[PDB]
């Protein structure tokens, strides 16, 4: 299928409580594989998935030196953002960054990304052409002008079209057994009587990977969207996900309700029903 | 490196 590598940085100032904290996390699709925390006793890039643990000391050293340099850059960016927004040094602020590449089934680059936020809102993003930027406010336009003059999009493009893709392609091979093998959901329908004439029909989906899934209830083949209590997809804690869709049905016609499970791990979409 | 080596600030 299609794949992606993403790195996520969070830089948070905390005046009076020490240096701003910098946290970086790396993912291949929905699997976290690396972490860096500037608050650790000995900050270092460390493995978070089994298939990256094998990497040699040159890998861990290189990522660690880069993450320490990025931690200090985002401490300086936090100070710059205060001047751009005319904010005082007393408040706590956050910069967030998301970047990486998307590849097709052939391993070829489909799209590069490099987006930033300041205090939970878009700040600046690299456009799909990887040669121009979108600034979201007048402070980000100062960064846009600076980055356009310093040729930053060309530097990002060279990384996104090269090493971002090359490393993603290596991780997908090294970890092909978990990364390239979709785990279909283990599904079941529970029944819980809520009243004398009504019952709740919960359509569960467990241990599926990747996280993208679609659960839909149907009353005699008709898609019921307003009567569905749909929960956000949540992690099981073992690199698999869970999701449920519950409906309130009249006690008697429970079997006229069919759950339609849509997932990459299933050859054909599944159809479920409560089996007493 | 697998991560981006940044070359500028904001």
């Amino acid at each position: 299928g299609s794949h992606s590598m993403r790195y996520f940085y969070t830089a948070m100032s905390r005046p009076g409580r020490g240096e701003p904290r910098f946290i970086a996390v790396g993912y291949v699709d929905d699997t976290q594989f690396v972490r860096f925390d500037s608050d650790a006793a000995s900050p270092r890039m460390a493995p978070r998935a089994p298939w990256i643990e094998q990497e040699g000391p040159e890998y861990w050293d290189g990522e660690t030196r880069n993450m320490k340099a990025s931690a200090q850059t985002y401490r300086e960016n936090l100070r710059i953002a205060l001047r751009y927004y005319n904010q005082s040094e007393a408040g706590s602020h956050i910069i967030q960054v998301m970047y990486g590449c998307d590849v097709g089934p052939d391993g070829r680059l489909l799209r590069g990304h490099d987006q930033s936020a300041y205090d939970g809102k878009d700040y600046i993003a690299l456009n799909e052409d990887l040669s121009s930027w979108t600034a979201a406010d007048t402070a980000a336009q100062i960064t846009q002008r600076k980055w356009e003059a310093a040729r930053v999009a060309e530097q990002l493009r060279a990384y996104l079209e090269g090493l971002c893709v090359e490393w993603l392609r290596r991780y997908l091979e090294n970890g092909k057994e978990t990364l390239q093998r979709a785990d279909p959901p283990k599904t079941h329908v529970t029944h819980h009587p809520i009243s004398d004439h009504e019952a709740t029909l919960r359509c569960w989906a467990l241990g599926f990977y990747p996280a993208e899934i679609t659960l839909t209830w149907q009353r005699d083949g008709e898609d019921q969207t307003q009567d569905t209590e749909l929960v956000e997809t949540r992690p099981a804690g073992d690199r698999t996900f869970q999701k449920w869709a519950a409906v309130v049905v009249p006690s008697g016609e429970e079997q006229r309700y069919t759950c339609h499970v849509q997932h990459e791990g299933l050859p054909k979409p599944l159809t479920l029903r409560w089996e007493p | 490196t697998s991560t981006l080596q940044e070359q500028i600030g904001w």
Partner: T-cell receptor
Amino acid sequence: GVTQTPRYLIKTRGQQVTLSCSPISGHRSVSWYQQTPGQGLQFLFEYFSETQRNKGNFPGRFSGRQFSNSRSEMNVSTLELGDSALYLCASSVGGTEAFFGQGTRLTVVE
Amino acid sequence: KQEVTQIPAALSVPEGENLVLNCSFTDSAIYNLQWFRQDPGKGLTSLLLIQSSQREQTSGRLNASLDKSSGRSTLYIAASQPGDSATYLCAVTLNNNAGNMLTFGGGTRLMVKP
């Protein structure tokens, strides 16, 4: 342009030197190189945001630093006669090419 | 792992003749290629920067070509002059590295005799 100081230095065997590099205003990364007639231009280390982000193959007595204003220094401990060389720094920013200073010509004497 | 080679390492050319200087590099995933000249008792003088294999950078009588796939670059000097005499260095920077991080070739000492 990039400015390096001192332009020329004479030091004695066993002592220490500290060389300075002021990159072009606004440049954030600085790399240091040693050029000897017999080994060509050899990379020492790259500094970005006060951090030694990349390092070459010189021993621990070849060290460096970079300040918040991007100015960088390099230091050589226990100077050997073989350490006599032109020490070059180069700066860059974003997607630019390298801009080099005029070097420090160091001669370690008996 | 990146290795940059300049062969021949020395060239002695009569003035007026066109000349070519060669550069090869083992890792094709480069961002920049720079040609420099170095005069005795001096540092580096940037001559040309090239980044695209389809484009060709020129600076007067100096012209440079690049072929990333083959790992090759050429610096052309039309109608050489004695003032062109110097050591010519080619250097390459990888993608996702600062432009100031170069792997240098060994250089070609060019002597253009009057």
